[PDB]
Amino acid sequence: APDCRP
Amino acid sequence: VQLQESGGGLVQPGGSMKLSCVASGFTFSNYWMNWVRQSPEKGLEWVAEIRLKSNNYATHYAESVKGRFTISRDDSKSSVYLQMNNLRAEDTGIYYCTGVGQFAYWGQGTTVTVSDIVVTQESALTTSPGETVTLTCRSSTGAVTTSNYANWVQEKPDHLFTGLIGGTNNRAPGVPARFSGSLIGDKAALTITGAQTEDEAIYFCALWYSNHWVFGGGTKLTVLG
Ligand SMILES: *[C@H]1O[C@H](CO)[C@H](O)[C@H](O)[C@H]1NC(C)=O
Numbered sequence: 001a002p003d004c005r006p
Numbered sequence: 007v008q009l010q011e012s013g014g015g016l017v018q019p020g021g022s023m024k025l026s027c028v029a030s031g032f033t034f035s036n037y038w039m040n041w042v043r044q045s046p047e048k049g050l051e052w053v054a055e056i057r058l059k060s061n062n063y064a065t066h067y068a069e070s071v072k073g074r075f076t077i078s079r080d081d082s083k084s085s086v087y088l089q090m091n092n093l094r095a096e097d098t099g100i101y102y103c104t105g106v107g108q109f110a111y112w113g114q115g116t117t118v119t120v121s122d123i124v125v126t127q128e129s130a131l132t133t134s135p136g137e138t139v140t141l142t143c144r145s146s147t148g149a150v151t152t153s154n155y156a157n158w159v160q161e162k163p164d165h166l167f168t169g170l171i172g173g174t175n176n177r178a179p180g181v182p183a184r185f186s187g188s189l190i191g192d193k194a195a196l197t198i199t200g201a202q203t204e205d206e207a208i209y210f211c212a213l214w215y216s217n218h219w220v221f222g223g224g225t226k227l228t229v230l231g
């Protein structure tokens with residue numbers, strides 16, 4: 001739910 | 007990757023100030039950006055986030071600054087901004103732009119001088135080179151789980167921050183293999199398998215709670231001999 005993009 | 011803040015300085019209580027941060031070395035527009043501030047008394051404190059163009063640039067704010075600060079971004083200039091109105095003494099601190107999975111990258115900070123969930127970490131731990139040491143991070147709400155997206159951030163001498171772990175268990179790029187993050191029991195945990203002298207630092211965890219981050223008070227890790 002936060003910016004879980006690597 | 008560089009993030010580089012500017013705009014800090016002296017402001018009178020009730021006054022306004024705009025901070026800027028320019029990003030390079032990563033695809034800025036693909037990542038959310040945050041402002042986090044560090045004070046003498048209140049420690050590390052998350053201020054604001056701004057999401058992507060596909061999220062209609064949605065913003066969220068700490069309760070302490072809601073209604074006084076506005077975060078924004080210009081993807082065309084790879085920059086994020088913090089407009090701050092009605093400043094108070096409690097707003098004094100060093101302000102950092104930071105982001106990526108979720109706090110891999112930190113700028114150098116810009117100082118602003120004006121004039122409830124608790125995350126708990128060990129105050130201090132002492133180790134020696136080659137030992138295995140585990141730092142922990144507890145939430146006042148219950149268990150830490152993957153939904154808290156635990157991050158671990160290292161502070162080295164004089165306010166230099168680098169993210170080590172995000173999303174509970176994911177080493178940021180270029181982070182040494184001796185660092186790992188996990189959940190242990192009902193807490194987030196940072197393990198250093200074979201501590202090294204240069205690992206002497208303050209380590210902060212941050213946990214996500216739906217729409218905001220809460221940082222722990224930090225653990226001072228001393229590495230003796
Ligand atoms: C993690 O964040 C990324 C980028 O913001 C995606 O939004 C992804 O869907 C997220 N996962 C969850 C569970 O919301």
